[PDB]
């Protein structure tokens, strides 16, 4: 099994399509840069998972709701920036900055947290979490964007040791990353995937 085939069996086809469109906009070829493609799929899925089930009620409070209720039509606690094309990503960042008064980032982050009122940059790494954290922090002299890094081995590091989410939501993400690593190993793709990451 090539990595390209694994990606299509491992990830939901909507994620694969959003990831493919992002790669093309980002200028890379999914059929060549197969480890990048897997990484983008993984990161995007992690961005979706971070946001799942978290909402702001009509009383302005952050609550959790796992039942996919047909009447549950509340404002999401997070807005997702990743997966949108640049035009639409800036449209959303602009709206957020208007609606909330928060400082506009110079780089597109991945998420906005309506409770904490801050952008979030997500990192998913096969390397060491601390070094990836520093790389991100360096790359975005912003200082107002919260950084949250996950590794496939279950480590995490976030700005000021503030992990934003409850432990169970993070464990949900960590379980999906455990699974991806486990399944890659079984098809002998993990070693390649892990060494392929670069700064
Ligand atoms: O121009 C870009 C931006 C992002 N990415 C990839 O998209 C994923 C998410 O990026 P980030 O939101 O953590 O920057 C990473 O796998 C990163 O390498 C690219 O390949 N090119
Ligand atoms: Mn991003
Ligand atoms: Mn990110």
Curated annotation (Swiss-Prot):
Functional summary from the UniProt entry: Plays an essential role in viral RNA transcription and replication by forming the heterotrimeric polymerase complex together with PB1 and PB2 subunits. The complex transcribes viral mRNAs by using a unique mechanism called cap-snatching. It consists in the hijacking and cleavage of host capped pre-mRNAs. These short capped RNAs are then used as primers for viral mRNAs. The PB2 subunit is responsible for the binding of the 5' cap of cellular pre-mRNAs which are subsequently cleaved after 10-13 nucleotides by the PA subunit that carries the endonuclease activity.
Q: Where are the transmembrane segments?
A: none
Assembly, per entry: Influenza RNA polymerase is composed of three subunits: PB1, PB2 and PA. Interacts (via C-terminus) with PB1 (via N-terminus).
Q: What is the covered span of the full protein? A: 1 to 197 of 716
Where are the active-site residues found?
136
Q: Give the family, as the similarity comment puts it.
A: Belongs to the influenza viruses PA family.
| Binding residues for Mn(2+) 2 | 82, 110
Q: Where in the cell is it found?
A: Host cytoplasm; Host nucleus
Q: Which domain of life is it from?
A: Viruses
Q: What is the protein's given name?
A: Polymerase acidic protein
Chain sites annotated for binding Mn(2+) 1 = 43, 82, 110, 121-122
> Which residue ranges does the UniProt annotation give for the motif Nuclear localization signal 1 (NLS1)?
126-141
Q: How is it modified after translation?
A: Phosphorylated on serines and threonines by host kinases, including human casein kinase II.
Q: What is the name of the gene encoding this protein?
A: PA
């Amino acid at each position: 099994m090539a990595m390209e085939d694994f990606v299509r069996q491992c990830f939901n086809p909507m994620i694969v399509e959003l990831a493919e469109k992002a790669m093309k906009e980002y200028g890379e070829d999914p059929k060549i840069e197969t480890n990048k493609f897997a990484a983008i799929c993984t990161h995007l899925e992690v961005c979706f998972m971070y946001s799942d089930f978290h909402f702001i009620d009509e009383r302005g409070e952050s609550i959790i709701v796992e039942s996919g209720d047909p009447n549950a039509l509340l404002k999401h606690r997070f807005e997702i920036i990743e997966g949108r094309d640049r035009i639409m990503a800036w449209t959303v960042v602009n709206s957020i900055c208007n609606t909330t008064g928060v400082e506009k980032p110079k780089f597109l982050p991945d998420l906005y947290d309506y409770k904490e009122n801050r952008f979030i940059e997500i990192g998913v790494t096969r390397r060491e979490v601390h070094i990836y954290y520093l790389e991100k922090a360096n790359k975005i002299k912003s200082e107002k964007t919260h950084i949250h890094i996950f590794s496939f081995t279950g480590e995490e590091m976030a700005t000021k040791a503030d992990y934003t989410l409850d432990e169970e939501s993070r464990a949900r993400i960590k379980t999906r990353l455990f699974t991806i690593r486990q399944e890659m190993a079984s098809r002998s793709l993990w070693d390649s995937f892990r060494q392929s990451e670069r700064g």
